[PDB]
Design brief:
41% of the residues lie in helices and 4% in strands. With 112 residues, it is mostly helical. Bound molecules: magnesium ion (8 copies). Belongs to the universal ribosomal protein uS2 family.
RNA sequence: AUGGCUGUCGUCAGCUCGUGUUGUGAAAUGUUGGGUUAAGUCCCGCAACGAGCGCAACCCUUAUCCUUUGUUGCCAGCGGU
């Protein structure tokens, strides 16, 4: 059921064809998602995230679009996980060996 | 055939590498873009993240002042010559 609040979908422009099964679609030439399809998927995702946390893992929230910036740092501060709040540095994971020095370099400033 | 040394483009601001990513590949990106600088100088942005040789600084000299020392250098204030 509609556990959600009020979003009823968005993104009138440039709709991706391969998302047709998730589209309900109607008003004011703006697509609206099929929340009936969403709820089982969101619950399934929520259940899985838990399993991971239960084996002790990090989730690394990612959301860099202004609006959500503060929303992310807070949600990630709580739950003691980690987050990326601003521009995602290309290669932040593929070459972790190089960004590691930047972290170590950063740690130096805080201590000094 | 060479070492060493030297001129020259040019004291011009450029030249590259590690990892990552893109391309079948030669390669590309970074190093491009908006401003700015004498400067690849700096800031912002950005599949790039960092680094090196260059630029700048550290060197010599010149322009002001202070402390120390005062002869073979100096003579403001004192004595007569
Ligand atoms: Mg390849
Ligand atoms: Mg170049
Ligand atoms: Mg290039
Ligand atoms: Mg530029
Ligand atoms: Mg430079
Ligand atoms: Mg750049
Ligand atoms: Mg120099
Ligand atoms: Mg006299």
């Amino acid at each position: 059921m509609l556990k959600a609040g009020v979003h009823f979908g968005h993104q009138t422009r440039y709709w991706n064809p391969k998302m047709k099964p998730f589209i309900f679609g109607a008003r004011n030439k703006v697509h609206i998602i099929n929340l009936e399809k969403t709820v089982p998927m969101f619950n399934e995702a929520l259940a899985e995230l838990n399993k991971i946390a239960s084996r002790k893992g990090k989730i690394l929230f990612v959301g860099t679009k202004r609006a959500a910036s503060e929303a992310v740092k807070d949600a990630a501060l709580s739950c003691d996980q980690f987050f990326v709040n601003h521009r995602w540095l290309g290669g932040m994971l593929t070459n972790w060996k190089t960004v590691r020095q930047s972290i170590k370099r950063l740690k130096d400033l805080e201590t000094q």
